[PDB]
Amino acid sequence: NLPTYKLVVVGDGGVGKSALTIQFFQKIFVPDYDPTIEDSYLKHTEIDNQWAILDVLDTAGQEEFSAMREQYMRTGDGFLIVYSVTDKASFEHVDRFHQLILRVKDRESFPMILVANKVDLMHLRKVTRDQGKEMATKYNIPYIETSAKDPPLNVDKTFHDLVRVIRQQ
Numbered sequence: 001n002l003p004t005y006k007l008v009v010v011g012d013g014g015v016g017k018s019a020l021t022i023q024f025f026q027k028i029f030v031p032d033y034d035p036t037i038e039d040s041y042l043k044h045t046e047i048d049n050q051w052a053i054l055d056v057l058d059t060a061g062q063e064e065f066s067a068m069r070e071q072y073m074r075t076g077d078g079f080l081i082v083y084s085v086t087d088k089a090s091f092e093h094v095d096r097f098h099q100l101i102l103r104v105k106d107r108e109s110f111p112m113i114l115v116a117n118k119v120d121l122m123h124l125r126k127v128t129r130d131q132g133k134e135m136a137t138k139y140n141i142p143y144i145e146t147s148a149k150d151p152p153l154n155v156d157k158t159f160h161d162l163v164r165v166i167r168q169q
Ligand SMILES: Nc1nc2c(ncn2[C@@H]2O[C@H](COP(=O)(O)OP(=O)(O)O)[C@@H](O)[C@H]2O)c(=O)[nH]1
Pocket: 011, 012, 013, 014, 015, 016, 017, 018, 019, 020, 030, 031, 032, 033, 034, 035, 060, 117, 118, 119, 120, 121, 146, 147, 148, 149
């Protein structure tokens, strides 16, 4: 019985949700991907020598204009909450997404990873590693730093780690 893991990528506009998801599925960096296009992606893949189907929603735009958002939020098996280390507001807003997930899933905790994207940027970085890690510690969830830019950092690891969390819960 091959399981499906339905994964939902959430976070403020501009943090790199699309770039990360495209890097994962297509192994290329696509800059400035249409900000409002919401795509899902489905593939069989092997993680830690166990096959699964990943059904991934790259969220975009307003929930009230999305055909698929409601079902993915309600039935998702795990979430990536992404912020950009160059956008302090996107970091602050992690709390909004965290609350939203726990409200919709109606649980005290739920599989999720905190993803600090754009760590290839140094001068523009406004959120420190320690700020990210403390937030993850507060929520009792894993923390990972990523870059979707070539060569990508921790992109496969992020999606795989979310699957690992779902399997470990
Ligand atoms: N330097 C850098 N820029 C990135 C990275 N990921 C995305 N971007 C850029 O950040 C902007 C927003 O990315 P996008 O994937 O559209 O974010 P989304 O709105 O969350 O889907 C675009 O200009 C991207 O080219 C990254 O890891 N590093």
